[PDB]
Structures are given as structure tokens and as C-alpha cells.
Amino acid sequence: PLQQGDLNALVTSVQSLALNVNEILNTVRNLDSRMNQLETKVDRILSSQSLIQTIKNDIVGLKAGMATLEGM
Amino acid sequence: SPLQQGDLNALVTSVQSLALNVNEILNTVRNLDSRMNQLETKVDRILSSQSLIQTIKNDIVGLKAGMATLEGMI
Amino acid sequence: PLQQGDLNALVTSVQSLALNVNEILNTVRNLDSRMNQLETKVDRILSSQSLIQTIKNDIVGLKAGMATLEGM
Amino acid sequence: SPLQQGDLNALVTSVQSLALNVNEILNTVRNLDSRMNQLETKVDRILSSQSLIQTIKNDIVGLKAGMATLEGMI
């Protein structure tokens, strides 16, 4: 007849699995928070690409206006 | 003490409780997978503009040699 | 006397846990690969910051050389 | 068939095998946590340079008004 103690190894194995799963949970919740931060900052970088092409358009005018000066 | 059905049932509920934590992990890593894919797309867009900077650097060098030409002509 | 079938619910519960853990594993291996790609591309962006300050130095000269032209 | 110790032992080994997969997940998510921290630091460095672009845009606008001044003076 099986005894309660015959289940001990299985109980301990599940306890250990639960401890390690809990640490995964803690870590992935932190990854979720980190990803929020990364997304916000990448969106910030991407918005500044407006500057880039404004600089681009202005430089076109600077090149043209300067060919004028070279002519004069 | 003889092993009883209730002892096995206790482990079932423990495993099913653990399964809820596993389910949260799985939902969250799938969400992270989708969000990292979107992040890479935006990083791609930033990269494409970066060498437009290379052209800017070239245009500016050209403006430099020109302005020297103006001064040299006097 | 407990019978083999009395363990069925526990066996099934562990099978389901294993299936779902396997899908987490598949997903996190994919996150690892995605992170390699992100790291490589962010390093690429960061290196181009050299351009930025080169543009910065040159513009300083353009501002100065141009004050000269304004004087002339 | 009466439940036997070997039936319980089979579940122990199954759980311990599952634990190896859990261990790989845990090692990998910890590594991802470290790498996302480093990634954010590099994203910070990119952000700091981005508004140096804002100054560039300003200097270029100034060069624009100047070059018009040169042409206007003739």
C-alpha cells in the first residue's frame, strides 16, 4: 500500500518547478516594462527624422543660392 | 499514512495553479515577440535615414570647398 | 486501493503544462534571434553618429568663413 | 491495475525533464533582460545626438538667411 511519503519526490519536484516558473514570471514582467521604455524612446528618435529632411531641403537651396554667388 | 485520492488531487490543483502562471508567461512572450517585430521595423526606418546623413555630410563638404572658392576669388 | 486511473488527471495536467512550456520555449528562442537583429541594427545607427559631429565641425567653419564673406 | 510506486516515479521524471526546459527559458529571459538594458543605453546615446540635429537645423537656417544677405547686398 502506497504511503503519503511515497509522493514526496513528486511534491518537491512540483514545488521546484513552481519556484523557477515564478522567477521567469518576474523576469518577463520586467522585460515588458523595459519594452515600454524602448518603444517610447525609439518613437522619439523616429520623430526627429523630420529634422533630417528639413536640413535636406534647406541644403538644396544653399547649394543653388551658392551657385548664384559663384556666378557673381 | 496511506496515500489517498485527495493527495493526488492536491497535486493536480497545484499543477493547474502553476499553469495559470505559465499562461501569463506565454501571453507576455508572444506580445513581446510582436512588439520586437514592430520595433525592428521602426529601427529599419531610422537606419534608412542615417545615410541620408552621409549625403548631408557630402553636401556640406561641397559647400565648404565652395565657400573657400568665393574667398579665394575675393 | 488506488488504481492507475486515479493518476490520470495528474498525468494530463503535466502533459498540458509541458505543451505550454514548450510553446514558451519556442517563443523565447525567437525573441533571442530577434534581439540579435535589433542589436546589430542599433549598433549600425550608433556608428553613424560619427557623421553627425563631422557635420557639426564643418558647419562651424561654414559659419566662420561666411562671416568673412559678409565682411567683404 | 493497482497504482504502483513506478507510476509516481514516472511523473517525477516527467516533471524533472520539464524543469530542464523551464531552466532554458529562465536563462534566456535573464539574458534578454541584460541585453535590453544595454540596448536602452545605446538608444539613449542615439537620442542625445538627435537634438544635435536640431542645432544643425538651426545653424543651416542661419546660413540660409546669411547667403540671402550676401545676394541682397550684391
Side-chain angles (χ1 to χ4, degrees):
Chain A
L2 291 171
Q3 300 296 121
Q4 271 187 300
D6 295 322
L7 206 62
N8 284 355
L10 191 47
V11 170
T12 298
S13 300
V14 172
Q15 283 175 355
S16 181
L17 200 72
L19 191 158
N20 283 274
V21 165
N22 284 335
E23 288 308 330
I24 296 166
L25 203 41
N26 290 338
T27 307
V28 301
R29 289 162 181 169
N30 286 343
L31 299 185
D32 194 354
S33 297
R34 283 189 183 286
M35 188 61 45
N36 294 337
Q37 291 152 21
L38 280 171
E39 293 169 331
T40 292
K41 293 180 175 183
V42 167
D43 282 349
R44 270 223 290 291
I45 297 165
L46 193 61
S47 73
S48 55
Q49 261 74 52
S50 55
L51 303 181
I52 306 305
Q53 178 239 6
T54 281
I55 296 171
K56 183 252 216 212
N57 290 333
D58 288 345
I59 296 192
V60 172
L62 291 183
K63 302 245 274 181
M66 194 219 178
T68 297
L69 273 35
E70 297 234 80
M72 311 165 158
Chain B
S1 210
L3 192 62
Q4 307 279 323
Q5 184 70 48
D7 296 307
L8 303 182
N9 295 350
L11 276 176
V12 175
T13 309
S14 289
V15 170
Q16 293 176 345
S17 295
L18 188 42
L20 295 167
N21 287 347
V22 165
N23 191 61
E24 182 188 331
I25 296 164
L26 182 49
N27 291 335
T28 298
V29 297
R30 291 195 216 277
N31 182 246
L32 286 170
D33 193 37
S34 303
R35 290 159 64 191
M36 290 179 61
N37 184 72
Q38 303 161 201
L39 199 66
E40 182 163 3
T41 296
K42 291 184 168 156
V43 165
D44 283 340
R45 295 157 69 175
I46 299 158
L47 257 169
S48 70
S49 206
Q50 285 312 98
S51 100
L52 183 64
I53 298 182
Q54 174 83 201
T55 58
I56 290 170
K57 187 251 182 299
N58 297 331
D59 286 336
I60 283 168
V61 174
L63 290 170
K64 204 143 61 73
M67 191 164 306
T69 297
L70 303 196
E71 317 193 29
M73 302 195 289
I74 281 171
Chain C
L2 291 171
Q3 300 296 121
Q4 271 187 300
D6 295 322
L7 206 62
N8 284 355
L10 191 47
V11 170
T12 298
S13 300
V14 172
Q15 283 175 355
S16 181
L17 200 72
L19 191 158
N20 283 274
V21 165
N22 284 335
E23 288 308 330
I24 296 166
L25 203 41
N26 290 338
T27 307
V28 301
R29 289 162 181 169
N30 286 343
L31 299 185
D32 194 354
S33 297
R34 283 189 183 286
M35 188 61 45
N36 294 337
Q37 291 152 21
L38 280 171
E39 293 169 331
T40 292
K41 293 180 175 183
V42 167
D43 282 349
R44 270 223 290 291
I45 297 165
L46 193 61
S47 73
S48 55
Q49 261 74 52
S50 55
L51 303 181
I52 306 305
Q53 178 239 6
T54 281
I55 296 171
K56 183 252 216 212
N57 290 333
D58 288 345
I59 296 192
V60 172
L62 291 183
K63 302 245 274 181
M66 194 219 178
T68 297
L69 273 35
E70 297 234 80
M72 311 165 158
Chain D
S1 210
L3 192 62
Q4 307 279 323
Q5 184 70 48
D7 296 307
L8 303 182
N9 295 350
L11 276 176
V12 175
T13 309
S14 289
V15 170
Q16 293 176 345
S17 295
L18 188 42
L20 295 167
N21 287 347
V22 165
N23 191 61
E24 182 188 331
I25 296 164
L26 182 49
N27 291 335
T28 298
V29 297
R30 291 195 216 277
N31 182 246
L32 286 170
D33 193 37
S34 303
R35 290 159 64 191
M36 290 179 61
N37 184 72
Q38 303 161 201
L39 199 66
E40 182 163 3
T41 296
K42 291 184 168 156
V43 165
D44 283 340
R45 295 157 69 175
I46 299 158
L47 257 169
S48 70
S49 206
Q50 285 312 98
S51 100
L52 183 64
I53 298 182
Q54 174 83 201
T55 58
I56 290 170
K57 187 251 182 299
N58 297 331
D59 286 336
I60 283 168
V61 174
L63 290 170
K64 204 143 61 73
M67 191 164 306
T69 297
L70 303 196
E71 317 193 29
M73 302 195 289
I74 281 171

